[PDB]
Symmetry: C5
Subunit: 324 residues, 5 copies
């Protein structure tokens, strides 16, 4: 049973060199705050107990089953689910005792997206592999990442990849940090351009005379269209506890502006039906409304240019598992 035990690197902990190949990052669900990825881990260590003389055995390398020798058991804390593409992996041992193990796994990890600037947002996704059954005094990790992503035409593009071994760790672990950027024009074309078009159409329709019956129906139809579009947008966007996307606030402000315009039009048309004062009031309101729309657009642009979130470090992030 001594074979299952971790090899002893004298006083120093055993060093395991891990190479991570990120094959693909396919599902990035902002609503579920999860990112799905595919990884290949090549773990290399030295096990002098498995070394054999070349005279007795002429093979320069042998293959052993997963449970026939010590292999680190990696667990991902942020991963909702992990699917290992080999239920019975085989480790490879050289004549000098070097052991190499290849593991292909598809995971759905947790990513804290910074959706403040949706749909142009940069997020950091961390995949932390822990050797829970071992301690840092026995196991040490040396992690490298290779960018082997096979899909590039997706909405979210991975542009920065790094690996790091956090210090002051009791449980040996290594984390791969990747940076995700959104380059999808679907949201903009689908919702932002039609929303601005509807807002400009309402502003233009403000020039219709108060006594025109067609003014009311046109405004109400625009309001209904914007209500449908706003419902679609908010259903298509997640809600954060602290920093919701500025897009939903901007759309809510525009919806309130459209409601205010429609309500003013209806109220003044009713008062007129009951140059008179309501017509002058309507003209003044139209000017104030145009000025307010321009001011709102400028204010939203300024907020987008200069925005930040302190947010709050999660208890897992503030106090990582197996520290100190």
């Amino acid at each position: 049973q001594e074979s299952i035990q971790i090899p002893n690197n004298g006083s120093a902990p055993l060093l395991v060199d891990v190479r991570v190949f990120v094959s693909n990052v396919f599902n990035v669900d902002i609503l579920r705050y999860t990112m799905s990825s595919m990884l290949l881990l090549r773990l290399s260590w030295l096990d002098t107990r498995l070394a054999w003389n070349t005279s007795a055995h002429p093979r320069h390398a042998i293959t052993l089953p997963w449970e026939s020798l010590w292999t680190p058991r990696l667990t991902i804390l942020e991963a909702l689910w992990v699917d290992w593409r080999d239920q019975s992996p085989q480790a490879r041992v050289d004549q000098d005792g070097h052991v190499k193990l290849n593991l292909a796994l598809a995971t759905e990890t947790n990513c804290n997206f910074e959706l403040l600037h949706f749909p142009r947002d940069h997020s950091n996704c961390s995949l932390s592999f822990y050797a829970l059954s071992n301690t840092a005094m026995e196991l040490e990790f040396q992690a490298h990442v290779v960018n082997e992503i096979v899909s590039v035409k997706r909405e979210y593009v991975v542009y920065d990849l790094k690996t790091q071994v956090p210090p002051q760790q009791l449980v040996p672990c290594f984390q791969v940090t990747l940076r995700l950027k959104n380059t999808a024009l679907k949201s903009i074309i689908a919702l932002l351009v039609p929303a601005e078009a509807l807002l400009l159409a309402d502003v233009c329709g403000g020039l219709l005379p108060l006594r025109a019956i067609e003014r009311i129906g046109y405004k109400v139809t625009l309001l209904l269209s914007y209500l449908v579009l706003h419902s679609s947008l908010v259903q298509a966007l997640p809600s954060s506890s602290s920093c919701n996307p500025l897009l939903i606030y901007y759309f809510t402000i525009l919806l309130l502006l459209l409601f205010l315009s429609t309500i003013e039009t209806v109220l003044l048309a009713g008062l007129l039906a009951r140059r008179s004062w309501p017509e002058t009031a309507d003209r003044i309101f139209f000017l104030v409304y145009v000025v307010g729309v321009l001011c709102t657009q400028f204010v939203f642009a300024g907020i987008w240019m200069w925005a930040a979130c302190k947010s709050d470090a999660a208890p897992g992030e503030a106090a990582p598992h197996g520290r100190r």
Copy 2:
């Protein structure tokens, strides 16, 4: 085969210290009344039969497979499904016989959400781990919970976590109770603000003269928009047997008010077309309608401020499994 048997702590039952780290609570489906979480259980006990002399073996700790020694089999009653992130877990045994076992599991448990005050509701979710194959006379649990949640910007935020071992239990068990609060602005912005805006727009449109043809079409378009919004809300909200959310009742009342306003407008316009009496009736109805809308808003606010549900304890909750 004696190794598989549970260790004997003399007359007293064996004590197992369980530490639970809640890594994340990601899916909280109100429609399915289920909450999905990720947990790490560290179970520590003492097995003097596994102790070895340090002279014979110089290793201070060894690793054994899952089935090579006694390990408690934990089962979650409320969990729809449990996925263990290690099909072949390894227990760690010290030279003194202390055994530590780490198990990472993603579960989808059942939570009875108190959706009366949606979208601002506080719910209690209980995850009960039972050792069905054992009895309380042989196994005893000591549970502690560590808040290591890695996601904080989700709609539902866990703010209170506790562990408790219910008394008078035949089957040894321990339950982790967490408190879930909803901090999502998606529902409010998506549906409550547009609903109030539509209600105020209808109230304002009540001032349109009865003889105005544009009055009818405007009211009907508002009614159609509110019908779409109400259908979306009710489809997006679950139905409870006893205490449905007050939001659906409030929206139904508002929809009935809009239908009443539209029906009155159409009826009086038709009667007038066939200061006359219909105009006076329309003015009186408009005043009564405004007063009724204000009264309804105040009544709903008062109900929200002072509401409660006796509800009913479920048979599983009233009579937990393995009691007495």
Copy 3:
């Protein structure tokens, strides 16, 4: 290999006492005609071959792996999928030879819902456990059910639970029958109240004069709203081969009535535009339409009060597997 063999209860078949605890019934999908449940089965039998003298071994109870002794293999015929929450269950054997086995399983079984009276329908769901590898001459089942349901605020409520062992069976089996009732107000509030409101609004709008241009647009907008609502309802309701819900027929009749009203209004307005005869015809049609709506409501209420379906027993239900 004799341990794996079923114990011999002399000439009579071996008796296995099964206790079923229904922890929860969470998914009840009318569209898929499936019901998802969670069960705990405690199977107790007597195996004198496993009895041991208390002098040789002081343990009063031992635990054995799943494959180390004979354990009945239960299969559910109606279950779309079964997930056992313990891949390596352990049986418990007393010193007298009594064996107790606990199995927690989440299943998605097939339920033939009687959706004639949707959304107030009572259905019977049967979960049949068969020991396919055994015969009735060797294995006998004694089943009891304990109501330990942990969720009570769901749309569907289980109110009656029973267990029965069908007679004249070749393959030993036992079935748990539960009664499901629908107490969800979501469907009613979402679709029935708005449909009746739209119907009453159309009836009231029938009083608009034929020469009023606003009459046509109002009717068409109501027709469009009812078309959307009807499409939503029919998409949200399953279709049965024999007895479709009366709700879809009632909504189809109401939709046809609305189409007839709109078509009559348009036809008579066109004829008038080309007390004149069209106005008298419109008044007579309005009276006939109101009478017909009242008669249709009364007829639907009477049908709901007195309705039944002979339906047809399925081949599996008429001829259960392993009978005679």
Copy 4:
């Protein structure tokens, strides 16, 4: 290791009698072209090597694990996924050597639906079980099917079931062919009746005078309603490479007719606004439109009565695996 080897039936191949019980056919997804079913396979063969004298052993039947004796490994080619409801099945061996094995499996196989006459279409679904590891010179299959379907009130009803062993096969296989018919009224009530109602409403609205302003808005609202309904239908129906359903073509033709009517109405109203000639043209177009609608309905009925598809045999269907 000779026990694992297939028994030798002299020169002739070993004969395995397979009885298939179709418990249920639950998911029939036309969009995915897949059919989900549940089957119980009872495989009986003769293994004289397992026969034992009744004097040495008094048991008339024994149970053996899945891997302790030769059992054919059945694979389904058309099955997207197969879930075996017993990870460790047990075979039953009599004293004479007869071996019976029961396997319960839920599969999602591929069915080539003939959706030309949707929603009244008849399709053939074939489930082919192959013994890939064996050859026809060693293994022979004798398949029978028993109709034990437990669900009868679903949209799709299985009415014909057969089993056949294709000739000139190298890999021994047997296929179960079932006939699926659609008896769902959901599609008709949801979409066909409203579409015909909208078409008749548009035809009736054609009688509105050209100078009536209400004519244009009514036509456009009907056009919008039909656009929504058409989008819903096409989204709810799959697209075939060769024979798309005639329903989508019929709805496209009706949509084009509605667009033509609306465009003609708008064009002639504009020309008139700029008995005059446009009124005569509108009357002639209305007559031609009514005649064309009737002719289109008759032509569609005739096409439905007399329609066929040569289609094309798939490479798998034309050249089945393991033939010749």
Copy 5:
């Protein structure tokens, strides 16, 4: 343990002949950029260590379990998930030592669809099988593909299949490349024909006089219908980082044209209400709008005829795993 080791083909690497039968390609999700397929791999090699004399054993072929002999472990890099339809496959060994292994697997691989010309696009999907545990100096692959697809009436049709073993590989691998073409008329009929119909209807409605009140409402209703259709299309189409489909750009241009037409109509009607100059401006704008619509259609047709994407090779595609 020497049996598990890879056979030695002298100095040259061992040659494994792989035959791939593509049973079906069922799910082609453009939104997820994934393609789901079903494959049967027949791997044949020579293992002289397993050869036996025909005199000692009369069997001409034997079956061995998966782990009783060396079998290459194939891993798919692009596959999101792989489901092997046989958890315990059996290899077949002849008397001469030839070993044949049949593996049926359903995979969901990653395909980089060239969605520029949606819905008529040709894509290349590559399924790469790697023997990670082995090196090219020991293992060599010879791959052949057989077109045994059983489904032909799906939206996406596979018309070209090839296999290739990339040169200069360290890890032995072979990739199957298939060509996917879209033959679905669902998208065209659902969205392109209605969009062109709406555009032509708006062009025709441009002839309505500026003083006609019905002109504004008709234009706004067409705009709302096109907004709904555009939202449906963009929701139904994925967004690419580099080359989004030209269809979304064309629909955005048409939506902008409709917004411009509606805004111009409203502005000029308002100015006129406040042959006059606005009428002449409206006529000139109508002519310019018709010319612009024709020019836009011609430009889009020309772009469709002559379009290309340089795009960018993904890091995995540019530098395949296990090269050099």
